[PDB]
């Protein structure tokens, strides 16, 4: 990893007391995608600082992709000439937030539109008379379709009679039968 | 306010992704077409599907109760 | 439902086995809201009313879609759907015709199952710019007519790949074919 | 025009749908990240495995044709 050679020296020299705070921040960044404060604290110019950030991210992104065990991560770290004291910080940080980090990447949808909010309300009409008209309730469904490309919700409204919502329920029960066949 | 004209799905399990070698995490793809001629396609995580499925169960129970109470209202 | 089974007996007015065969195929493939376009010619077929004919086509549509859905591949499993008092020679005819199409019908539905927008055609060119090579990657995407709106279903995308980005893409297409091997390891 | 900058994909199998109870079909979805004129776009595509291998095979043909220069 001839490119890594530069980063291994830069990271080893970084202040170990400041190192866990930055790792947590990059993990927070990874579930999706201030510089001046880092430039002053770590004494690196913008282009130089970025190589460290890119290297840490690449390490974490590789670690998440393979779901590496703590012993497996340190086995790779010890082979690339990183000093153990930095490896101890990586392994500690990974051992705690690891599975939850992987789960978000395991949960993150590719497609643009994802259902975010589900809201129901029910609407009723009332018959004190002998027969004004024997008339049903009807439900309406709020779907919050997150266009995650934008983070703009389409709040979509669909209305059901009891005569319809039961048919829709049988389809959801069919989906559940399929989804339970995955066991 | 539109009623559902058609409702359609497929149940998928994602085996691998650009950032995870072996995810095995399922999702339900939904497509609605509606009585106003609108249509929507969206992906529903399993947690959000259980919410939707449970919500429909409540609203069916209320509707069937209030419908039954109207027979008590004729009596 | 009982109304469906009552409607299916209308096939006993049919003129050929093919009339039953073709009505089964057409009842499955046209969408549930779309069956209506043959109603008068269907009426003339069997000499039935338009309202009877719609329930007939819906009866076949529900029957054929349910058979396709469950992949019913034995006669007893199909015959078990029918009542004791339901015309035997009609149900044998329907059962045969179902088994003649169930593989085809099940495939036709899997070709029109929902998806994200689907690649339908693909083309590429290499082209030297004022000097350095570039690739003009040309894709035709087909979106569902229900959902694109009044825009066309088929939309063309054209992408410049440079040599550098082409390597990043083939690295990705690499990992995919690798992932497509490592399934169910260990 | 439309210079690619990044790519993502989801690879999986379809357990079932509205029309078929058990399906077992296999699909590749791609997300292509594109730019023109300093604004990004995402392009979304779904592929069968035949279409993946043909997409791979053809993009390999491009690589042979591009490395041929300098």
Author numbering:
A (entry chain T): 12 to 44, 53 to 202
B (entry chain F): 149 to 223
C (entry chain N): 5 to 134, 143 to 198
D (entry chain S): 131 to 200
Quoted from the paper:
The Commander complex is required for endosomal recycling of diverse transmembrane cargos and is mutated in Ritscher-Schinzel syndrome. It comprises two sub-assemblies: Retriever composed of VPS35L, VPS26C, and VPS29; and the CCC complex which contains twelve subunits: COMMD1-COMMD10 and the coiled-coil domain-containing (CCDC) proteins CCDC22 and CCDC93. The COMMD proteins form a distinctive hetero-decameric ring stabilized by extensive interactions with CCDC22 and CCDC93. These adopt a coiled-coil structure that connects the CCC and Retriever assemblies and recruits a 16th subunit, DENND10, to form the complete Commander complex.
While each COMMD subcomplex was relatively stable, only subcomplex C produced an X-ray crystal structure (3.3 Å resolution), revealing a 1:1:1:1 heterotetrameric assembly formed by COMMD5-COMMD10 and COMMD7-COMMD9 heterodimers. The four COMM domains form an intimately assembled core structure with HN domains of COMMD9 and COMMD10 located peripherally. No clear densities of COMMD5 or COMMD7 HN domains were seen, presumably due to flexibility. Notably, the structure closely matches that predicted by AlphaFold2 multimer. The COMMD5-COMMD10 and COMMD7-COMMD9 dimers interact primarily via an extended β-sheet augmentation between COMMD5 and COMMD7 COMM domains. Two critical contacts involve Leu129 in COMMD10 and the analogous Ile118 in COMMD9; these lie within the respective linkers between the HN and COMM domains. The linkers position these sidechains to reach across the tetramer interface and fit into complementary pockets on the distal COMMD7 and COMMD5 subunits, respectively. In addition, the two HN domains themselves interact with the other three respective subunits. For clarity, we describe these two interfaces as centered around Trp157 of COMMD5 and Trp139 of COMMD7, as these Trp residues are the only residues that are strictly conserved across all homologues and species of every COMMD protein. In both interfaces, a serine in the β1-β2 loop forms a stacking interaction with the sidechain and a hydrogen bond with the backbone NH of the strictly conserved tryptophan residue of the neighboring COMM domain; Ser148 of COMMD7 forms a stacking and backbone hydrogen bond with Trp157 of COMMD5, while in the second interface, Ser166 of COMMD5 forms a stacking interaction and hydrogen bond with Trp139 of COMMD7.
